[PDB]
Amino acid sequence: DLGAPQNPNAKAAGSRKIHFNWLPPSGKPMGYRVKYWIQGDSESEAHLLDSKVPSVELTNLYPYCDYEMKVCAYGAQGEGPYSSLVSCRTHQEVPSEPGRLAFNVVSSTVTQLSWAEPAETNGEITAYEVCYGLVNDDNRPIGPMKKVLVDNPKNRMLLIENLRESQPYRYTVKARNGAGWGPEREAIINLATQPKRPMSIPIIPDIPIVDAQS
Numbered sequence: 001d002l003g004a005p006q007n008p009n010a011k012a013a014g015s016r017k018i019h020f021n022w023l024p025p026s027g028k029p030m031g032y033r034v035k036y037w038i039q040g041d042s043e044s045e046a047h048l049l050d051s052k053v054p055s056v057e058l059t060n061l062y063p064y065c066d067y068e069m070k071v072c073a074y075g076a077q078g079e080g081p082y083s084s085l086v087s088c089r090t091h092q093e094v095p096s097e098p099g100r101l102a103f104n105v106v107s108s109t110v111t112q113l114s115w116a117e118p119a120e121t122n123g124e125i126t127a128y129e130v131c132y133g134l135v136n137d138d139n140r141p142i143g144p145m146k147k148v149l150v151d152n153p154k155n156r157m158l159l160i161e162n163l164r165e166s167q168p169y170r171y172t173v174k175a176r177n178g179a180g181w182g183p184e185r186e187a188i189i190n191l192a193t194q195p196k197r198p199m200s201i202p203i204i205p206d207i208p209i210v211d212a213q214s
């Protein structure tokens, strides 16, 4: 009968892969079976992965996610006992796009911009960046985009005033986590063609309002 594989050891091989290896038990193991699952699920619902060598690469994993796993050998007598558990967390990767940009337009020159958190954060989001710029009718920039800097970049809304009347602008929003900046959500809008609705702004410090012609 085979003993348990020894020194089970796992290391992230990326944001969607883990490398798990162990020492062959003495005897004549024919192969190994690995059980692995997301932290918070269960061994009873484990994924089951066969290997003919004393290592495996776990694939199609979630980014920034803890996985638990263990491994047994099988041989002439069937499966031996499993190794002790190991836990390993995949790397972060950049977030997905923010949600579709929402514009609550106040006037011909003022709009609120807001967006939902990325559907996949793939890590811990530490900031958003909003850019905006004039475009012509083919979404071709007229001059450079402008980057907005704000006191709290984790906020998902911005007020923008002093936009040029009846001109289209491109707006973009992207999100950052520990892996870096993810892809941009873009929208092109002209306030002239939007429904107008009044806004109430509490008279308090640090309102995130951007002057578009400065």
Ligand SMILES: [Cl-]
Pocket (backbone or CB within 6 Å): 013, 014, 015, 016, 017
């Ligand atoms: Cl990967």
